[PDB]
Amino acid sequence: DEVX
Amino acid sequence: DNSYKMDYPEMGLCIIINNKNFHKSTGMTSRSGTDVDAANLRETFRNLKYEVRNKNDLTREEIVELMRDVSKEDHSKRSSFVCVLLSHGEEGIIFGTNGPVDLKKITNFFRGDRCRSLTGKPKLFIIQACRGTELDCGIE
Amino acid sequence: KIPVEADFLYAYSTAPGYYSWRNSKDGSWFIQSLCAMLKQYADKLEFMHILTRVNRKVATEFESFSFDATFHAKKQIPCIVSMLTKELYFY
Structure with a gap:
């Protein structure tokens, strides 16, 4: 999981 | 009549702006997995009879440029307009590969007086980007 | 005569x-x-109604994982x-  | 007339010759356009790789100078990390989104979206909207156009890694200028040109086209035979933006961002701003573009700016290209061919037609903007830095801790 | 901001939909x-x-x-x-x-x-x-389904799906079936607490x-x-001024269907 990664953020934008 | 209480629903949009979708019987025009073609369903409409569907611009998908997929930004994965950013310039070193910006300090923005690559958006891994965005290709899957770009690919998935392309298929779905294809099956909906839209004229899909994939644009990858565009600079803030190329984004405005594209939106400017797309608004100047004739949409009289088109039912709607869909615009998807996959990228980094913040409230009211989406990132081009070299810098931020405020949503309001590219949105204006399609508002009434600017794009008369789309007047009375649904202009949809689907946006996958951050809108700040808060985190939702959930409950239950 | 209608508003210039009418007929817009932003799905965030x-x-x-x-x-x-x-x-x-x-x-x-969101996209998937x-x-x-x-x-x-x-x-x-x-x-x-479709978008509402998405809201439920994303809100229900997804939760993040990271080594960073x-x-x-x-x-x-x-x-x-x-x-939007009217209902929208894809048919």
Whole structure:
């Protein structure tokens, strides 16, 4: 999981 | 009549702006997995009879440029307009590969007086980007 | 004569001021849920109802994982902003  | 007339010759356009790789100078990390989104979206909207156009890694200028040109086209035979933006961002701003573009700016290209061919037609903007830095801790 | 901002719909992946989640291999929570729902209901439901399904899917079936306690076990709820004047169906 990664953020934008 | 209480629903949009979708019987025009073609369903409409569907611009998908997929930004994965950013310039070193910006300090923005690559958006891994965005290709899957770009690919998935392309298929779905294809099956909906839209004229899909994939644009990858565009600079803030190329984004405005594209939106400017797309608004100047004739949409009289088109039912709607869909615009998807996959990228980094913040409230009211989406990132081009070299810098931020405020949503309001590219949105204006399609508002009434600017794009008369789309007047009375649904202009949809689907946006996958951050809108700040808060985190939702959930409950239950 | 109608408003210039009328007939616009902004489907945001997350709530105002929040981060939005993306997965390295699966894609973003929002988009993958969006396409799923479109495929199944684009020929049965009105757009607003489809987006509501997406809200439930993203809000229910997804939760983050990370070794960084701060970004671990976080949730997301999309946000629909409609200024559409009529109902929208894809048929």
